[PDB]
């Protein structure tokens, strides 16, 4: 008469829990997700035998620590995560070696951020992020997207910045070994700095890796200051800038394009073969890479 299921808050530790058949799950379990669905108001049936129910109401102190360890979330973020998980049901389309999202709820910034991240080899210290990333790489990205949306300040159905999505992801990745050596030269003097982690693999102010290698000038109280990377030791590099209709720098693997003014629309181009242009779930071969580029990805090897 009772169905045996597994209860968890973190997907790491589980306890057996029983629910009477025909009874609404929330009555005994509180708010619950099962296989990515909010089943709080679903009536218990034998089809759910042995399945895993993620709880997120009435979290104890010990539960909150487990959630922080596995998700990196506090309670409001966790609730935002499950809200996002319930709402973000965007169809995913496979385009050769990559996947893309149908246009929906102003998700172009997510689409092109995910198209760029599909080039990267990343590992995540937090269990839920690593597991969602494995599903992401298998072509099931919605759980990973929901983590990112909850971790950041993103609002569902609102147009946003693809660089913020990528940065939220990269701050969760293990980038312990990534560094770059910078030198700065102006009339103020000469200083060195070694950037690490996300600060080593993301650079804002130019799209062209060659600008970093050669040096390029930024504003300074003395007039201008040369910024020069004397050594790269990163697996990849994302150079970002205010959208500009410049020529695509050499050696770029993929780039994000932002079209419009205050509110706009993202597209994405890959350069192997030159070129594949993505717009939502459409992909077309084109002979030139043009548009107002805003993020450029470089890869080692």
């Amino acid at each position: 008469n009772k169905v045996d299921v597994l209860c968890t808050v973190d997907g790491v530790n589980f306890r057996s829990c029983c629910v009477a058949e025909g009874e609404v799950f929330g009555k005994t379990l509180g708010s619950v997700f099962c296989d990515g669905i909010n089943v709080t108001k679903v009536r218990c049936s034998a089809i759910y035998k042995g399945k895993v129910f993620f709880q997120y109401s009435d979290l104890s102190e010990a539960d909150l620590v487990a959630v922080k360890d596995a998700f990196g979330f506090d309670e409001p973020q966790l609730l935002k995560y499950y809200t996002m998980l319930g709402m973000c049901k965007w169809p995913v389309v496979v385009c050769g070696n990559y996947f893309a999202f149908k246009q929906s709820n102003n998700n172009s910034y997510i689409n092109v951020a995910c198209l760029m991240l599909q080039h990267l080899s990343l590992k995540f210290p937090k269990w839920q992020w690593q597991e969602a990333w494995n599903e992401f790489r298998s072509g099931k990205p919605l759980r990973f997207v929901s983590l990112v949306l909850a971790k950041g300040s993103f609002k569902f159905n609102e147009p946003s910045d693809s660089i913020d999505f990528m940065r939220v992801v990269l701050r969760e990745a293990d980038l312990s070994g990534a560094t770059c050596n910078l030198e700065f030269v102006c009339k103020c003097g000469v200083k060195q700095e070694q950037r690490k982690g996300v600060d080593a693999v993301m650079h804002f102010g130019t799209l062209d890796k060659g600008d970093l290698v050669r040096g390029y000038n930024i504003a300074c109280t003395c007039g201008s200051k040369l910024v020069h990377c004397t050594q790269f030791n990163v697996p990849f590099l994302i150079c970002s800038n205010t959208p500009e209709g410049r020529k695509l720098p050499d050696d770029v693997v993929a780039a994000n394009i932002f079209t419009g003014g205050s509110v706009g629309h993202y597209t994405h181009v890959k350069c192997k073969p030159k070129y594949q242009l993505y717009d939502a779930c459409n992909v077309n071969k084109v002979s030139e890479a043009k548009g107002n580029f805003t993020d450029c990805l470089y890869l080692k090897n």
């Binding site: 102003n106 998700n107 172009s108 910034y109 092109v112 300040s153 609102e158 147009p159 946003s160 910045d161 693809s162 660089i163 913020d164 940065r167 910078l182 700065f184 700095e193 950037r195 600060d199 993301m202 650079h203 804002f204 102010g205 130019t206 930024i218 504003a219 300074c220 109280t221 200051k225 910024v227 205010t242 959208p243 932002f258 419009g260 205050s262 509110v263 706009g264 629309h265 993202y266 805003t294």
Partner: protein
């Protein structure tokens, strides 16, 4: 102490701050001078994005340093 913020229009802003100020603090001050909501502001120091919760001292931002202000894009 004074720091300077270069904007996309070309204008250079002068802020009065202490090394203990947070980036969130700096963004609030920018809103006061220019009216730009902090949630739209991206602050950069020599190519490095500056995170809200950290302080100027954490980033080695000293007197008369120049930051760059850009707006977050809104792509749907």
């Amino acid at each position: 102490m004074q720091i300077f913020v270069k904007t996309l229009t070309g204008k250079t802003i002068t802020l009065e701050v202490e090394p203990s100020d947070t980036i969130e603090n700096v963004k609030a001050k920018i809103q006061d001078k220019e009216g730009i909501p902090p949630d739209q502001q991206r602050l950069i120091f020599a190519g490095k994005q500056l995170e809200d919760g950290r302080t100027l001292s954490d980033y080695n931002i000293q007197k008369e340093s120049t930051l760059h202000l850009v707006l977050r894009l809104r792509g749907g």
